[PDB]
């Protein structure tokens, strides 16, 4: 009986050979795997359907931006964002080099393109050999090291092959034989481009694919290492229908010119011809102003490399364009008719929260549960989880190490909180009583938990000084060395102009004057907490609750709070918010330093002003309906990075449909409470009853478009 045909076995200690100490881990991937087929198609494909029921699935896996073969797949075993390990796209161009980027060229094989440190290279450091065949980054050196046993990329090797290869390695002395194992095949991403998802030629790919890695299960019987071997059975990204309706020509706008390279994809970058002569002196933002609101119902967007959602963590690196492209689904950009390949031809590339850029996930071995379905997660959190299976020590990445230990029988490493590295001071009544010049027109522990029900933000920030100013209805983290809060935490439940108060715990500044605030300049302030909390709530006009905001995000700020906010109470039964502002002036998504903080303040009507690049805002609710925030058993947690820009020509306002530009505004923000944490330096939910490695389950989580 082969492999395929026998039912599940538990494979709670691992059954062995002689020679082997532990199970050796192979990374199976099926290039342009859309999460959806297995949805679908999994009564045609057998050999796979039963590595879902018996191993550790997950409906759909989270690849990276942009979605294509390259960046995923080395941000696999590297666990870092794309835009930190060098590998932006297929096609690419570093201007410090002056050197473009492609899979058929001499240049691919250039060491000084691949950054971080992949797990063959982390393996070979720890003395732990590795065997791979056609993975990207194994046919490099990278760090001076190669793979005991690579191959050099060449497609026109047979399947079949390929897994005998593999095969023939696990037969190798106990000395010379790997530990840890690489498969590729480009199926069914190579069916998926030329005849679309929905075809005759991607099911006879899936069932090609499906009986090769029955190939594989029933090679590993006849070794006796079948119930011995962690197999990793994953893609890259999934595929989309293209259309020739359903393509963008930017010729149509600029002319048939010639100063500007287009990167044509769903995934769009521009840089200017005379590169890098004019690579920065090329001033894009006029460019990309005049690309916006051209259309009624515009399917790109023109972004400005730091503009870029938050979310997709696609700036800080001299390979990617300073100015991209964002698409509806099914929609690709291009200068040209001409530049592209075809418009009619199945793609990807497209944004990574949309459903059919989703991939493939399978955990099956000794060390994964059996029959056991997890939530969505990132690819960068693959890399910690293979640490764990190869007994190594992770290299620095972007992955939360110990958010996936719900995939195995019994996990290796136990993460911790974050110990607070600022510097906690307080703040009694020093300073009474400077006049502010406004118009108005006519115990303690009991309060505290009320407003903070999940634990305070705890401070990352080292070694920041922050006071804690307690309210009646919200409890602020205040910050000494900036003068304004760093966040502001309150309960808001089911059912429940020109004026200000100086808060005599924190020192005056001139900022804090409404006669600062003239109504003729569009920067003004906004309130973290509304003061329209339960007559009229007056601590929240306290001065250390406001921030520096311009008048065209006020308008989204105050529909944030005064209609959805109070939509999601009633839905969701109540829900706790933190708010405040974020400075990450240099994009790379992470904190900035005292130092680099003194380099951006801009001084605007006679003052010193430090403004926020961004404001955050994290909703959480309990996951039972029946339950207040106050009592949850269970979070339902939804954070969002939300732009402070001058004008609001991202959203096209023009047409006046208010109710609608704003939460689509806010729904494209949507980020990752690790994204929060990461560039604010605050830490959430530590006195929360959940393990550690819950929280960080519930932190690194993001909802699918569509
Ligand atoms: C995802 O995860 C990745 C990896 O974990 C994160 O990427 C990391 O980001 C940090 C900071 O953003 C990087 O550290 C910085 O490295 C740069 C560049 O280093 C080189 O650049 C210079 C060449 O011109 C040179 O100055 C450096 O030389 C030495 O510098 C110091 C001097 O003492 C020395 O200690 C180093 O060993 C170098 O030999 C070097 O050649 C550097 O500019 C940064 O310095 C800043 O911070 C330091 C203090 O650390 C400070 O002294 C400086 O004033 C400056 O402010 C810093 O070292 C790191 O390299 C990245 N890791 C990798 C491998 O990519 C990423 O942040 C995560 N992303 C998200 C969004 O979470
Ligand atoms: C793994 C690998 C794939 N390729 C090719 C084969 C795939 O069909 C192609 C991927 O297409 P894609 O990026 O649009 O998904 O890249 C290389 O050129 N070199 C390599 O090392
Ligand atoms: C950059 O490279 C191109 C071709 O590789 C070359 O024509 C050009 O002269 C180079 N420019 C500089 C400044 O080296
Ligand atoms: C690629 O692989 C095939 C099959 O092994 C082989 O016949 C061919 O010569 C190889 N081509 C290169 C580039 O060596
Ligand atoms: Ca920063
Ligand atoms: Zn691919
Ligand atoms: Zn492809």
């Known amino acids: 009986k082969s492999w395929v045909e026998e039912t599940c076995e538990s494979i709670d ?12 881990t192979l990374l199976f991937s099926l290039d342009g795997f859309r999460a959806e087929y297995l949805h679908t198609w999994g009564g045609l494909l057998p050999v796979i359907s039963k590595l879902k029921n018996c191993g550790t699935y997950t409906k759909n896996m989270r690849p990276m931006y942009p979605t294509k073969t390259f960046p995923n797949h080395y941000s696999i075993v590297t666990g870092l964002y794309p835009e930190s390990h060098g590998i932006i796209d297929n096609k690419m161009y570093d201007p410090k080099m002056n050197a473009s980027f492609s899979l058929k060229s001499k240049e ?6 691949y950054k971080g440190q992949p797990i063959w290279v982390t ?27 690579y191959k050099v990329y060449n497609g026109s090797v047979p399947f079949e092959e390929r897994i005998l290869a593999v095969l023939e390695w696990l037969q190798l002395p106990s000395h010379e034989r790997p530990h840890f194992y690489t498969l590729y095949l480009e199926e069914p991403d190579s069916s998926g481009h030329s005849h679309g998802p929905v075809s005759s030629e991607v099911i006879k790919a899936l069932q090609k694919v499906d009986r090769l890695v029955g190939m594989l299960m029933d090679g590993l019987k006849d070794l006796g290492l079948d119930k011995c071997l962690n197999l990793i059975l994953i893609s890259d990204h999934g595929m989309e229908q293209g259309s020739c309706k359903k393509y963008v020509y930017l010729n149509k706008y600029l002319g048939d010119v010639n100063n500007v390279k287009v990167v044509y994809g769903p995934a769009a970058r521009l840089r200017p011809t005379d590169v890098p002569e004019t690579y920065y002196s090329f001033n894009y933002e006029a460019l990309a102003k005049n690309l916006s609101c051209r259309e009624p119902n515009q399917h790109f967007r023109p972004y400005l490399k730091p503009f870029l959602p938050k979310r997709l963590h696609f700036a800080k690196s001299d390979r990617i364009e300073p100015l991209t492209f964002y698409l509806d689904p099914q929609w690709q950009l291009a200068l040209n008719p001409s530049e592209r390949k075809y418009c009619g031809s199945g793609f990807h590339g497209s944004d990574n929260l949309f459903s059919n850029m989703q991939a493939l996930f399978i955990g099956y071995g000794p060390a994964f549960k059996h029959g056991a379905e997890v939530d969505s997660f990132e690819n960068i959190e693959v890399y910690n989880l293979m640490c764990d299976l190869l007994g190594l020590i992770p290299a620095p990445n ?9 995939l195995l029988k019994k996990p290796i490493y136990n993460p911790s909180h974050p110990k607070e590295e600022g510097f906690l001071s307080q703040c009694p009544i020093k300073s009474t009583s400077n006049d ?23 401070i990352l920030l080292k070694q920041h000084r922050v006071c804690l100013l307690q309210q009646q209805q919200f409890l602020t983290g205040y910050s000494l060395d900036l003068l304004m809060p760093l966040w502001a935490s309150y309960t808001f439940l089911s059912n429940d102009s020109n004026c200000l108060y100086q808060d005599l715990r924190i020192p005056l500044s001139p900022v804090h004057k409404c ?28 001065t250390s609750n406001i921030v520096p905001m311009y008048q065209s995000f006020q308008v989204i700020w105050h529909y944030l709070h005064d209609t959805l906010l109070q939509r999601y109470a009633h839905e969701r039964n109540g829900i706790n918010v933190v708010s405040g502002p974020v400075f990450d002036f240099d994009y790379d998504g992470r904190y900035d330093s005292l130092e680099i903080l003194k380099q ?24 039972q309906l029946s339950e207040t925030p106050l009592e949850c058993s269970a979070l339902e947690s939804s954070a ?40 604010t330096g605050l830490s959430f939910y530590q006195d929360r009853q959940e393990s550690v490695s819950e929280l960080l389950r519930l932190k690194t989580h993001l909802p699918i478009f569509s």
Not at 13 to 21: D, I, R, V, Y
Not at 108 to 113: D, G, Q, S, V
Not at 515 to 542: M, Q, V, W
Request: hydrophobic content about 30%; overall charge negative; aromatic content about 10%.
């Open 13 to 24: 200690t691992p059954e062995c050979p002689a020679e082997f100490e532990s199970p050796p």
């Open 108 to 113: 691919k094989f250039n060491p000084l393109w």
């Open 123 to 149: 393996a070979n450091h720890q003395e732990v050999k590795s065997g791979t065949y056609f993975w990207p980054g194994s046919d490099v050196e990278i760090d001076g090291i190669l793979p005991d046993i």
């Open 398 to 406: 972007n992955g939360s190490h110990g958010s996936l230990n719900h």
């Open 436 to 458: 502010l010049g406004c118009t108005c027109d006519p115990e303690d522990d009991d309060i505290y938990h009320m407003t903070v029900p999940y634990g305070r933000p705890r």
């Open 515 to 542: 006669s600062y605030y003239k109504s003729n300049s569009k920067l003004s302030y906004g309130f973290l907490t509304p003061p329209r909390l339960n007559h009229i709530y007056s601590e929240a006009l306290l």
């Open 600 to 623: 951006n303040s801009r001084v605007i009507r006679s003052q010193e002003i430090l403004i926020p690049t961004h404001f955050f805002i994290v909703l959480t609710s309990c996951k």
């Open 640 to 679: 969002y990075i939300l732009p402070h820009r001058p004008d609001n020509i991202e959203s096209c306002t023009h047409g006046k449909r208010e109710s609608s530009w704003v939460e689509e505004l806010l729904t494209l923000h949507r980020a990752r409470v690790t994204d929060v944490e990461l560039i």
